[PDB]
Structure formats: structure tokens, C-alpha cells
Amino acid sequence: GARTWRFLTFGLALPSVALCTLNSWLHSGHRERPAFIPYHHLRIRTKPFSWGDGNHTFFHNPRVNPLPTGYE
Amino acid sequence: QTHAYHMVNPSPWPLTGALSALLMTSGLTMWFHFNSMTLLMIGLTTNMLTMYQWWRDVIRESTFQGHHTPAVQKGLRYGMILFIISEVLFFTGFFWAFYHSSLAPTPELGGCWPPTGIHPLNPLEVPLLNTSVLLASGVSITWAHHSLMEGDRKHMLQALFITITLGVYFTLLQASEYYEAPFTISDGVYGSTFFVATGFHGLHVIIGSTFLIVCFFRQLKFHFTSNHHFGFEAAAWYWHFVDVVWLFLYVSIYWWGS
Amino acid sequence: ITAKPAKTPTSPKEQAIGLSVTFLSFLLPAGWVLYHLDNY
Amino acid sequence: YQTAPFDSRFPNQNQTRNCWQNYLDFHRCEKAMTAKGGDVSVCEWYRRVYKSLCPISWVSTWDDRRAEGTFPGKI
Amino acid sequence: FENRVAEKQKLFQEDNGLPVHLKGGATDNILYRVTMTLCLGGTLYSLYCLGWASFP
Amino acid sequence: YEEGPGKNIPFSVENKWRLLAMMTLFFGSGFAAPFFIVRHQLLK
Amino acid sequence: MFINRWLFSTNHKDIGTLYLLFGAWAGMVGTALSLLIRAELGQPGTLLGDDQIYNVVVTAHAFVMIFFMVMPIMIGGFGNWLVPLMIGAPDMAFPRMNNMSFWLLPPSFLLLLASSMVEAGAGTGWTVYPPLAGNLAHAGASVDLTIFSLHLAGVSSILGAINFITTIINMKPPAMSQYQTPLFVWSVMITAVLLLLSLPVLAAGITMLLTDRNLNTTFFDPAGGGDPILYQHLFWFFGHPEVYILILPGFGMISHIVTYYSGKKEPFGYMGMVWAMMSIGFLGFIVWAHHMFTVGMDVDTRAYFTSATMIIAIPTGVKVFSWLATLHGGNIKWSPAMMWALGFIFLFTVGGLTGIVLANSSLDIVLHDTYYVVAHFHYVLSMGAVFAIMGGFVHWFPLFSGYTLNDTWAKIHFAIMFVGVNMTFFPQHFLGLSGMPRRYSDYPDAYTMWNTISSMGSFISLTAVMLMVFIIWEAFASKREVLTVDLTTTNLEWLNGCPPPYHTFEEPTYVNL
Amino acid sequence: GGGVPTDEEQATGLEREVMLAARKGQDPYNILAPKATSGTKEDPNLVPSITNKRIVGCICEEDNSTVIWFWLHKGEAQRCPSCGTHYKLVP
Amino acid sequence: MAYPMQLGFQDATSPIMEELLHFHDHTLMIVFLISSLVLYIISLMLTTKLTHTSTMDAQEVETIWTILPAIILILIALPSLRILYMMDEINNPSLTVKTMGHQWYWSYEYTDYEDLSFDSYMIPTSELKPGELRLLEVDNRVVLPMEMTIRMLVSSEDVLHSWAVPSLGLKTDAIPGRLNQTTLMSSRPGLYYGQCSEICGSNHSFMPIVLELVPLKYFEKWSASML
Ligand code: HEA
Ligand code: HEA
Ligand SMILES: CCCCC/C=C/C/C=C/C/C=C/C/C=C\CCCC(=O)O[C@H](COC(=O)CCCCCCCCCCCCCCCCC)COP(=O)(O)OCCN
Ligand SMILES: CCCCCC/C=C/CCCCCCCCCC(=O)O[C@H](COC(=O)CCCCCCCCCCCCCCC)COP(=O)(O)OC[C@@H](O)CO
Ligand SMILES: CCCCCC/C=C\CCCCCCCCCC(=O)O[C@H](COC(=O)CCCCCCCCCCCCCCC)COP(=O)(O)OC[C@@H](O)CO
Ligand SMILES: CCCCCCCCCCO[C@@H]1O[C@H](CO)[C@@H](O[C@H]2O[C@H](CO)[C@@H](O)[C@H](O)[C@H]2O)[C@H](O)[C@H]1O
Ligand SMILES: CCCCCCCCCCO[C@@H]1O[C@H](CO)[C@@H](O[C@H]2O[C@H](CO)[C@@H](O)[C@H](O)[C@H]2O)[C@H](O)[C@H]1O
Ligand SMILES: CCCCCCCCCCO[C@@H]1O[C@H](CO)[C@@H](O[C@H]2O[C@H](CO)[C@@H](O)[C@H](O)[C@H]2O)[C@H](O)[C@H]1O
Ligand SMILES: C[C@H](CCC(=O)O)[C@H]1CC[C@H]2[C@@H]3[C@H](O)C[C@@H]4C[C@H](O)CC[C@]4(C)[C@H]3C[C@H](O)[C@]12C
Ligand code: CUA
Ligand code: NA
Ligand SMILES: [Zn+2]
């Protein structure tokens, strides 16, 4: 019935989301970025991207996404 | 007629939909090759206008005109199941690409998975939260379904609102994840498989959330009866499909592939 | 199958015209391109 | 030594991993023998096998990447 | 909100010969004309783009 | 809508010679198109 | 009224007519491309002086014949016309979505003809394998326009498959079980299931190719840890089902035609025919890697794919023998449609048998990427599909139009086409065995005689095509209106007259239990 | 907690006609398979029609795959041309 | 190489091509017989005024129609798979040669002992020496010892190609990032021709393969000369 599924929603499901939210928020600190190495299997550029200067990924994050030549 | 099936009024939306497809595809071509977004933005606009008017007309035909007899509803049930099956097979192709690449990592990767230089996301942090969010939304949508069958307007709306809120939370968490990820779509086959498979999934979450929002407004306007609410059923089936694809992504790409 | 007599019978001469025009509609444009391949 | 013998580790038409493994083995052994100032002649079997099996362009690209610090295999 | 489905049933069942995509009134006509004009105009623009792209 | 032989089609069969012209343009345009595309590519 | 009827259709018959017109037009394009192929090969040396253009012509020839001629005619045309009539249904389940499956095809075709007009075309083969199809070896828009053409064709066919499966399952008379539906209806349902499952996998694969070309993904690029062979698996996982998709509606039409012109009320061994089509459909998903016997896969994998592929001969042979057993004891009417169907049975058998030769991976090493393969599929696919289409077309033209064809002209047409296709393709077996590669613009001098003969055959088939257009003109020009046809008791699609009214089965059939 | 309409309150058009006919045990829209009579001349199958003719399909024996199709006209009962089962039109 | 008006396979140069010829002869006899039976039965069904139009029972005849084809397929598959497993069987090669496909020519690497490598280009028709073969000759042939097991490794530096030599029973795709293995053994000296067998762009028709098979002593003299 509806009463049973509401009971599961508030008694199990949303508590689970609250506990996973607490777990995530406790581990949300910025990690120390690894040394840049210009590996040839990464930062692939076979054609410029169709936006910006052609060399930045769509959700480029300067802090953690180096360009082919390194961190900005 | 002395059959129960629906003879549909002649409609312009098939043609506007087909032309929207031409404009979106020619538009993507003109964006990738001729440095221009014009055709693409016309195509996206005509596609949204076509889907709005087509599904508006289905609501007019059913809620307002009474054309959805049990035989018609049975056909729509089959149609939605078959559509979901086609979407399962589309995802299967992306899983096949993922397993092909990760089970036999090539020398360019370092002959290992994850590749040399890839730092995967911790699957116990936001990916686990996303898992709890979509599983919870599968429980809340089931509460909504039972509330509607039991004739309870208030609890159907509360349960559906919670389901939509969880879908939006997943989408904002995934957007945040994408921005914080230290790897990109250009980081070899790891980034390719990650972003294309999770990105088509994220698109399906946005589609599913949109479908639930349509059901929320139709419910506010009293369209659904306790017995007749196929749009809600189809949106729930689609939502469960989105959940299940996530669980396979989580186990395959985030956990086993880390 | 059984049918009514032709409403608008197509005589042997009418058939020779239709056949000729049909064949020419296929052959002349392709012929023009193939003849001029050198010029291309 | 004539050519690389059958290796039961790599029994199929795709020999990519056979070339890769012997290249790694040669360079791991060479590093091990050099680091104690030991003798690289100990590494000779792997050198002959990878030289026999590996395309020149693969060897040359891998050598370049080792010198660049971008070789993705562990040596 | 109040249940106004009966009022919409009456509107969409009116014997006026209109197809369902125009039966809501003048706003349906405007939205149809905007859609079809963008589709047809867009298609003509795609053909122009084809003509441009077919040559160096 | 009009029903019956010659009336369930998007082209007229009222006049067999107008029909011959329309069928000529229809099938001829399709058959010609690849020859003219080959010509277009060669003239590049 | 004209725009409402023909652009805004929600009518299965009018949409079927649109598909037949579209397909016939596409067939002219495909045929023109085929004649350009055979003109390049018809004497040693170069004709076009541009082997990239030759490769574009070969690529376009295949896409047009498969996606714009066969599938639109068989599924969109005969399927939309006949399936609702054969089950007494008033239309398709989704009559408005049906119209969008149709209207996606002109844009799809426009994208293909854009691919060929921009840059230097997509000279890839219809397989579109990377890295030749990638952004280095095929820089620019042509391959992306080809990918988009296939996306639109794929959406059209997936939505069509949903429509046909729903219609066939949900819209029969309540007394009619699945085992009381005609074989053509079975053939369309099975075809639709194959489309629903196979096309999404193609869509995934060509989407990966799109992203490798434009978003710096490396699914198929070894520099990023990708693999060109992954593309081949995804393509062929679709592509083997696709070849059964192309023939299954043909098998359905052949069953109807052989039954009708043998004067029988029913095909021989109905449940065996259903079993055979379902068996072919199922086995069709587990055999794809027989397209990849030279790529370097493991011996045990080759052994499995040889063995699984050979199994398909068993249900296929049940159908061939069942057609023969339907002729057995018949009062045979030597109609032009019967001639097409008998040509089908023989030519399909020849092509199926050369398929069994190719299934043997060992021998396939020598035959792969040769004219032996081209000969195999022009028998089973090209002749099989086309002969089933022409048989269905001359059989059902009077239903669709209300007018009769000239039977003597139709027999002349058959005779010319039979000579032309056999003169074109039979010698390609010798070219294959003797080692001539496919996808070649020119050949070593030894191969001249059989290429010359093959190219002469191609012109005979062109004469047949031109005559077909005249024959259709002559029927519409003369206006011989149908009165009666025989065997309506076992051919429901005829029982509303010729042509049937816009709306049929407004009052459904009465069928009791 | 209420506020959701019922089919009885809100169904309209053909859906409502089907809903009301089912409550009366009537099948005007041909959703159900009719049960055969013995099909003799004294006890013919009674075939309803809104007009003067209707197509009958006869499954002569259980599990036949072949259906026999024919127009049944108003007037004297007609017989299935395969099994001779009698059918009578009842406008 | 092929010769004018040729109907069948090039004469076998290797034991595995011999096996394939015998296996094709076996399989073609079956193809002919089944093709002929179907045509004959069509003609038999169509040549009598006698009729039987009532329902026919299918059960008995479908046993024949499934069992007999199953037996035939087993009789094709058994020898087919025997040859498949022969062409995989562990051989001890005495020589490894690499070939790399390019747009549009082959390169060859003999790196067992010396770093020998060279490129192999089609001779243009305008440059053929009298009596030489249009589209088939190359500038630098693949010199190999006869009557010896050779390991060929095949890859590509650009797009897909396919390295083929019909008279030896050979066809191995050339895939960038992949090293595909095949075995070559010639029973005879001579020149053996093949052609690129995966579409690789505009000059696919024009990048042939020529093997030059010579006694070991002459192969060694050739290798020694290359220093
Ligand atoms: C209508 C389309 C169609 C159909 C139905 C088939 C049917 C079959 N095909 Fe074919 N095929 C193609 C279209 C088709 N094919 C295409 C387009 C290609 C090329 C793709 C490309 O590369 O571009 C291709 C390629 C292709 C290959 C790849 C070859 C290569 O590239 O090297 C192989 C490999 O096994 C294959 C096998 C078969 C087999 C075994 C069947 C079986 O289904 C045939 C079964 C039928 C019979 C056997 C005859 C009837 C049976 C009897 C009378 C009973 C008794 C018979 C026996 C006991 C044997 N085909
Ligand atoms: C259905 C599929 C189909 C059909 C019908 C055909 C028809 C023809 N094809 Fe082929 N072809 C392919 C599918 C098809 N083809 C494919 C998949 C390839 C491989 C491409 C690649 O390698 O990538 C190929 C490749 C191919 C090659 C090899 C090219 C090369 O390797 O370089 C050749 C060579 O001769 C050829 C010739 C022909 C000829 C001469 C015809 C015809 O001229 C034969 C006669 C048939 C007709 C003329 C059609 C008639 C039908 C109509 C006009 C429709 C009528 C409509 C109604 C009645 C409603 N085609
Ligand atoms: C938040 C959850 C979900 C977000 C949704 C995504 C937002 C943008 C686009 C939406 C469409 C998504 C579908 C999947 C397609 C491809 C890529 C999308 C995945 C994505 O968003 O990936 C991003 C890249 O996007 C890119 O390239 C740019 C992508 C934009 C252009 C894509 C164009 C390609 C369209 C392909 C069409 C295929 C249609 C198939 C139809 C089949 C029918 C048969 C990842 O960002 P990044 O900076 O590399 O790494 C993060 C580093 N901090
Ligand atoms: C910012 C947003 C960007 C993203 C844009 C992309 C698109 C998003 C769109 C989301 C989908 C919205 C669908 C709304 C459908 C409303 C119509 C509806 O739900 O119609 C119902 C029928 O269902 C039916 O047709 C069922 C109709 C099924 C529709 C299925 C939709 C899923 C579509 C996915 C789109 C393709 C994606 C693939 C990409 C790879 C009507 O019947 P009932 O509900 O029984 O009512 C009758 C009662 O009132 C009587 O008492
Ligand atoms: C690069 C980008 C290329 C992509 C181009 C996109 C292609 C085309 C543009 C799409 C425009 C969509 C417009 C809306 C379509 C709504 C269809 C729909 O909802 O169809 C319904 C049937 O399908 C059902 O239910 C179940 C089926 C519902 C399907 C909804 C639409 C899906 C479109 C994309 C799907 C791809 C699938 C992904 C798997 C590969 C209703 O059928 P109708 O016949 O209308 O009415 C019947 C009446 O009785 C109703 O009262
Ligand atoms: C009633 C119907 C009215 C239809 C009106 C159509 C709306 C758009 C018209 C203008 O077209 C735009 O022009 C810009 C140039 O002036 C382009 O810049 C493009 O080029 C830039 C390069 O500077 C890139 O950043 C982007 O791709 C992009 O902005 C842009 O893409 C393109 O769309
Ligand atoms: C693959 C399908 C093709 C099959 C072959 C078609 C058969 C040929 C049809 C005739 O085509 C015509 O041939 C003429 C020559 O006979 C050409 O005239 C050309 O040559 C004439 C004579 O030299 C000149 O007078 C003209 O100006 C000149 O255009 C003309 O252009 C062309 O239309
Ligand atoms: C209602 C029906 C719809 C009607 C269709 C509307 C057609 C609008 C025509 C405008 O055309 C635009 O012109 C821009 C300027 O000429 C181009 O800008 C782009 O092209 C420029 C060329 O200078 C580049 O600088 C940039 O990529 C960018 O600004 C752009 O591509 C193109 O779309
Ligand atoms: C008062 C009103 C009654 C609706 C009605 O019966 O017309 C209530 C019923 C359920 C309510 C919704 C549900 O309680 C769930 C949501 C609760 C949030 O705090 C506000 C928005 C929210 C989406 C509510 C909006 C509105 O207040 C609703 C729609
Ligand atoms: Cu190299 Cu084909
Ligand atoms: Na040539
Ligand atoms: Zn009966």
C-alpha cells in the first residue's frame, strides 16, 4: 500500500541519502594535484574542440585539468 | 467506427519533428566544421516546439476527448516497453565499449586499467551518494504510484515532488562531479567511456525528470484518475530504467573499473 | 484477376511514344555526363 | 638464436602483448643490471626476442617516451 | 487548484471541425505558424549552407 | 478525401501525357542525380 | 486538402504509398550508382580518373540500396499497406508516429547526398571503418553527414519497429491468435524485433565514431587505448541482423505469392515457416564475427562462428522446401509475380549456398574482401530482395492502384532482368576465386574478361529498369479497373476492393471462437 | 486523504462509452471474441452489424492457422465455404 | 598470380592452400548438387496437370528436411575445422619478418639479426619493363627462403590494410596498434603476388605484395649483401 511505501521512503530511503550526504561532505576536501606528465594517451587533440580556443574541454577546471602543455 | 482504436486527426508534428532532426544534424555539422551554432539552435527550438505540441495533443486526445480506451492504453503500454528495450540496447553498446577497453588494456595505457596517469573518483564518495539518491527516488515514485491508485491527491503530489527533487539532486551532484573530475573526455579511452556512458545516462535523467515534472503539473490539474494514468506509469517505468542503468554504470565504471 | 476494358486504351503507337520518352529520360542526361567526362 | 620461439603465454594471432612484454622485460633487466653496475648480457634473451617481434616504429616511439619520462609501462 | 477537466472536455469536444492541434483556439494557430515557419525557413537555410559547403 | 482508382495517389493520372512528363521528371531526376554528383566532384 | 492528406497523413495506406514512391526513386539513384561502378570496371584502366570518387560511389550505392530502397519498400511500403489489411485493423497502433518514420527518410537521404557533395565525399565503404573513416584519413564534414544520415534512418526504423510490433500484437481480432496471422505479418513482426535490438547498437557505434572525429574521444584510436576492431564488432552486431532484416519481409511476400499462384488456400507447413523465421532471427544475433575472420581473432572463436553460421541453413532449408511443397499439386498460374517468386527461390538458394562456403573461416581467409563475397550478397540480397520486391509489386499493384498491369510486358521485364543480373554477378564468382579484391577501381589485366562481361550484364538490367517505368506508366495510362480477384477467402487484403477505401475495417471483422 | 477523480466521474468520449457498455455486459466496440453456436441451419452464428454486410473470418477447427474470409450479407444465412458453418447477419 | 579466363583458385604454393583446394572441391560438389536439386524440384513441381490442393501434413517430411541438411553441414564442418586447427598448429619458424601497411605501400622489417628494412611500392604502368605485370610489380620484393616455416607479423602505421597472397592461402588484416601473426611456407621457388585487401582510401587498388622465394643459401647471400 501507499502507507508502506511512504514508511520506506521516510524510514529507510531518505535516511540512507542523509547518511551518504554526511559521508560525502566529510570527504569533500580538495586533493593535492599530481605532478604533470605529458603522457601521449591523455589530453588527446586530434581536432580542435568547437568552442573557446579549441584546446579546453567543455567542463575544464583550471585547478585539476592540465592542458597538453601542463597546468594553466 | 465499432472498434475501440484511435483514428488520429491529420497532424503537422511528424513533419516538424522530421525537419527538426534535419536541422539538429545539419546544425551539429555546421557547429563542428563551419564554426556556427545557427542551424543547431533553430533545430533544438523546433524539436522542443514539436515535442510540446505533439504530447499536448496526446493529452487533449485522452484526458479531454476520451480516445484512450483500454485497447489504446494496451498499445501504449507495449510501445513504451519496446522503446525502453531499444534504449537498453543503446546503452549495451557503451558497456561493450567499456568492457572491451578495460578487460584488454593496450600498451599505450601502460597495459593496465585504470590507465597510467588516470586518478579515478572514489566510488564511496559522490558516486555512492548518487546511488542512494536514485535508489531513494525509486522508493518515492512507488509511494506516488500507490497514492494515486488509492485516490490520495496530496500524498501523490508530495511523493512525486520528492522523486523530482532527488532527480535534480543527482543532476547537480553529477554536474559538480564533472567539473571536479581531474580527467576529461580527451583522457584516452578511460575519459571517453566515462563521459560518453555517464553523459548519455545524465541526459536520460534530465529527460526522465522532465517527464516526471509533466506528470506533476498534469496531477496538479487533476488529469489522472485513480485507474487511468498511463503517462505516470510510463514516466515511472522510464525512471526505473534510468535507476537500473545507473546501478550498472556504478558497478562497472565507478567500482569495478576503478 | 478480371478487369473492366481500359477507360483510355493505349494504342501500339501511344506505347512506342511512352517507351521512347521513358528510355530517353534515363539515357540522355547520363549520356551527356559520360560523353563530357574528358572535359571534366 | 634464429628467431623468437613459440611462447605458450601468447599462442594466438594477436602478438601485441608478446612484443610489449619482452620490451618491458629487456628494459627492467637492463635497469636492474645497470643499477648495481652488473652485466646487461644477462638481459640478451629479451633483447633478441623484442627486436625480432616488435615493429621498429613501436621500439623507436617507446625509446623516445622513456627518454621523455612519458613511457606508461612500469620499468 | 480546482478540477476544471470538465470545462476542457467541453472545449475539445466542441463540434467545430478543427483538428486537435488547433482546437485550443488562436494561440494554437500562432504556435503552429511559428513552428512551421522556423522548420521551413531553417530547411531553406540548410540547403543554402549545403550550396556554400559544396564548393571550396 | 477523394476515393477510388487514380484518386488515392499524390499525382494526377487524369491525362496520360502530363503523367508521362511527371513520371519522366520523377524517375529521371533520381537516375540523373549520381551522374551530376560525379561531375560536380570531378569539376573540383 | 493536398497538404493535409500527403504531408500530415495518419493513414496506413497513404503512408505506404509515400514509402513505395520514395523507395522507387531511391532505387533509380542506387541503380545509377551501380552503373557508374560497372562503367569504371568495364574495361582495364581508369574511367573517372579519381579513385576517391569511385570509393564514394561504391559507398553511396550500398547505403541507398539498403536504407532508402529495400527497407522503405518492404517495411514502410508493403508493411504499412498490407499488415493492417491482413489483420482486419483500422490502421497502425501509432498512426501519427508512423508519418514521422516516413518523413525522417527524405532528410536522411538529403544528408547522404550532402556527404557526397561536400569535400571529397565519404569514400569509406558502407562499413565506415575507422581509421579510414576518422578525422585524419577523412577530415571534414562528409563522414559526419553520413553518420547523421544513418542516425535519422535508424530513428525512422526503430519507431517503425515499435509501431509494427505493437500493431501486430495488440490489433488483431480478439479470436485471432498469433498462429492465425498470415506469414507476411509474421515476417514483419520478426523483422521489427531485429530492427529494435540491432539499430541501437549501430547508433552507439557510429556515435562513438562521431565523438572520435569531433570531441577527442579515442574509442577506436590506439593512441588513447582504443581499438579499431571494437567498431567492427559494434557495426557487425547490427550488420548481420540487418541482412536478415533485408530478406525476412521478402520471405513473407514469397510465401503469399507462391501460395496464391499455386491456387492453394495456405502455405505448406505454416508452423514450420513461423519456426524457421524465428530461428533465423535468433541465430542472426550470434554469428556477426564471420565478417571478421581475417582481423586476427582466436582459433576457437573462429571455430564457434563457423559452426553457428552454418546452423542458419537448417531453418532456411525448411522454408525453401516448404515453398516447393506449396507448388506441389498446385493449379499453377504462370503470372509475372509467380515468375519473380520462382526466380527468387532459385537465386536465393544459390546465394545462400555461397554464404555457407564463406562461413568456413579457413576458406574465408582466401575469399574475404574478394568478388566472391560481392557475388554471394548480390545473389542472396540484391536478387533475393529485388525479386521479392518485384513479385510483391506486380502481385499487389492492382490492390494499391485499382488498375491492372499488362501481363505480357511484365513477363518481358522479368525475362530481361533474369538475364541481366545473372550475366552481371555469376562471373564475379570466378573473379573472387581467382583473387580479385573488392573495393577496387582497376584490376590486373588477367581479370579483364569477367569484368567486361559483368559490366555488359549491368546494362541489360538497366534496360529492364527503364522498361519497368514504362510498364507502370502504361497501367496508369490505360485505366483497366479491377473487378474481381480469386482466392479472397484466404487473402483478406483484397476483400475491400481495389483500391480499398481510405478507411477500412471501421466495422471490424467477426471471428468467433 | 482523497481528491483524485475516478473514471466514473471523469472518463469521457469513447473511453466512457466502452466503460458504460461493459457495466451492462454489452460489447458494441467488438473488444471480446464472440462464442460460436453449433452453427447449424436451425442455430446459425448470429453476426451483428450496423450495416447490411460484414466480413466474417471462420476458424473452421480449433488450431487451424488458415482463416476463411467472406462477406456475410443481410438475408438468408450463408455458409463458410470451407466447413459449411452457418452465419446469419443481424443488423 | 591469376591468368586470363581463370575460373577457380590460383594453383596452391603452400600445403595449407593445397588443403583449401581439396576442401573447396568437396564443398562445391555439395553446392552444385543442392542448387541442381532445387532447380530440378521446381521444374518437377511445375510440369504436371495432376493436382492436390487440400491441406497436406508436414510432420514426416520436415524430419527429412532438417536431419539431411544437418548431416551435410557436419560433413562440411569436420574437414573445415580440421584445416582451421592445422593453420593454427604450433610451428617452429626459423625466420620472422614484419610488414607495415601505409597509404599506399608496404614496408618490410627483417630484425632477427640485422636491422634490415625497406619500402615496397607498385611500379607505375608508365615505368613497367617489357613483359612485367600492370598493377602487380613492386620495386623491392619480399625475399624469403623456400621450404621453410616463416612467421609474418602484420601491422599498419595509418589506416587498416590487409596483407594477402592468394596462392599461399594468406590474408591478415593490418591494424594500427596490433601485431597480427600468420605462418608462410612455400613448397616452390618463384614470384607470388597479392594485393591490399582492406579498403584504405584512394590508392587501395595500387599497393601490391610480391614474394620472391629462393633457396636458403641465396636468402643468406641476399641478407649478407644488405649490410
Ligand atoms: C539478404 C541478405 C543476406 C542474406 C539472407 C545472407 C545470408 C547468409 N550469408 Fe551473407 N552477406 C550479405 C547478405 C546476406 N547474407 C551481405 C550484404 C554481405 C557482405 C557485407 C559486406 O561486407 O559489405 C554478406 C556476407 C557474408 C559473410 C562474410 C564474408 C566475408 O566478408 O568474407 C558470410 C560468412 O559466413 C556470410 C554467410 C551467409 C550465410 C551462411 C547465410 C545464410 O543465412 C544462408 C542460408 C541459405 C541457404 C543455405 C540456401 C537454402 C538452403 C537449403 C536449400 C537447405 C540445404 C542447404 C545446405 C545443407 C547447405 N555472408
Ligand atoms: C539491396 C542491396 C543491393 C542492390 C539491389 C544492389 C544492386 C547492384 N549492385 Fe551492389 N552493392 C551492395 C548492395 C546492393 N547492390 C552493397 C551492400 C555493396 C558493398 C558496398 C561496399 O563495398 O562498401 C555493393 C557493391 C557492389 C559492387 C562492388 C563494388 C566494389 O567492390 O568496388 C558492384 C560491382 O559490380 C555492385 C553492382 C550492383 C549492380 C550492377 C546492381 C544492380 O544494377 C543490379 C540490378 C538491380 C536493380 C537495377 C534494382 C531494381 C529496383 C528498383 C529500381 C526498385 C523498384 C521499386 C519498386 C518496384 C517499388 N554493387
Ligand atoms: C550533468 C549530467 C549530464 C550532462 C549532459 C551534458 C551536457 C552537454 C551535452 C549534452 C548531451 C550529452 C550526451 C552525450 C554526448 C557526448 C558528450 C557528453 C558528456 C559530457 O558532458 O562530457 C563532458 C565533455 O562534453 C563535451 O565534450 C561536449 C558535449 C557537447 C556536444 C555533444 C555533441 C554530440 C552529440 C551526439 C549526438 C548523438 C545522438 C544519438 C541519436 C541516436 C538515435 C538513433 C565532460 O567534460 P570534460 O571537461 O571533458 O571533463 C570534465 C573535467 N573537469
Ligand atoms: C531541458 C530539457 C532538455 C531535454 C529535452 C529532451 C526531451 C525531454 C522530454 C521528456 C518526455 C516528456 C513526455 C510527456 C508525455 C505527455 C503525454 C502523456 O503522458 O500522454 C499520456 C499517454 O502516454 C503516452 O502517450 C506516452 C508517451 C511516452 C513518451 C516517452 C518519452 C521518453 C522520450 C525520450 C526522448 C528521446 C531520448 C533518446 C536520446 C538518446 C496520456 O494518457 P494518460 O496519462 O493515461 O492520460 C489520460 C487520462 O487523463 C484519462 O483519465
Ligand atoms: C543527432 C540527433 C539526431 C536525433 C534526431 C531525433 C529524431 C527525431 C526528432 C524527434 C521528434 C520527437 C517528437 C515527439 C514524438 C512523440 C511520439 C509518441 O509519443 O508516439 C506515441 C507512440 O509511441 C510510443 O508511445 C512509444 C515511443 C515514444 C518515442 C518518443 C520519441 C523518440 C525519439 C528519439 C528516439 C531514439 C531512441 C534511442 C535508442 C537508440 C503516440 O503515437 P501517435 O501516433 O502520435 O498517437 C497515438 C494516439 O492514439 C495517442 O493519443
Ligand atoms: C526569427 C529567426 C531568426 C534567426 C536568427 C539566427 C540566430 C543566430 C544568427 C547569428 O549567427 C551567429 O553568428 C555568430 C557570428 O557573428 C556565430 O558565432 C559563432 O562563432 C564564434 C567564433 O567567434 C564561436 O564562439 C561560436 O561558435 C559562435 O559564437 C554564431 O555561432 C552564429 O550562431
Ligand atoms: C549508364 C547509362 C548510360 C547509357 C548510355 C546512354 C546512351 C547514349 C544516349 C545518348 O546520349 C547523348 O549522346 C550524344 C552523342 O551520341 C551526346 O551528344 C554529344 O555529341 C554529339 C555528337 O558528337 C554533339 O552533337 C552534342 O553536342 C554532344 O553533346 C549527348 O550529349 C548525349 O545526351
Ligand atoms: C526563421 C527561419 C530561420 C532563417 C535562418 C536564419 C539565417 C541567418 C543568416 C546569418 O548567417 C550567419 O552569418 C554569420 C556572419 O556572416 C555567420 O557567423 C559565423 O561565421 C563567421 C564568418 O565571418 C565567423 O566569424 C564565425 O564563425 C561566425 O561569426 C554564421 O555562420 C551564419 O549563420
Ligand atoms: C496546498 C496544496 C494543495 C494542492 C491542491 O489540492 O490543489 C498542496 C498539496 C501538496 C503540495 C505540494 C507538496 O506538499 C510537496 C511540496 C512541498 C513544498 O514544501 C512546497 C512545494 C510542494 C510541491 C507542494 C505545493 C503545494 O503546497 C501543494 C500542491
Ligand atoms: Cu592498403 Cu587497401
Ligand atoms: Na577502372
Ligand atoms: Zn469455416
Side-chain angles (χ1 to χ4, degrees), chain B residues 124-199:
Chain B
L124 295 168
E125 298 171 356
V126 172
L128 179 62
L129 171 56
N130 276 340
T131 305
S132 74
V133 165
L134 290 183
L135 287 171
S137 76
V139 178
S140 57
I141 205 171
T142 304
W143 171 25
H145 189 209
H146 284 275
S147 292
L148 178 59
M149 291 186 288
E150 297 177 30
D152 186 341
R153 169 180 177 74
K154 177 179 76 149
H155 292 131
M156 194 289 211
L157 287 161
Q158 178 183 44
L160 181 49
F161 182 82
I162 289 165
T163 308
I164 294 164
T165 298
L166 290 164
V168 171
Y169 187 31
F170 174 95
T171 302
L172 292 172
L173 287 164
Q174 202 73 313
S176 178
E177 280 260 273
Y178 276 18
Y179 182 70
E180 299 294 335
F183 54 83
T184 76
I185 199 167
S186 73
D187 284 343
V189 71
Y190 183 93
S192 298
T193 59
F194 184 97
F195 285 110
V196 174
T198 68

Side-chain angles (χ1 to χ4, degrees), chain D residues 51-52 54 56, chain I residues 96 98 109-116:
Chain D
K51 250 221 342 95
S52 285
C54 298
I56 290 165
Chain I
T96 299
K98 290 158 280 158
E109 311 174 4
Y110 299 65
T111 62
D112 280 333
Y113 317 110
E114 280 312 313
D115 274 68
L116 170 60

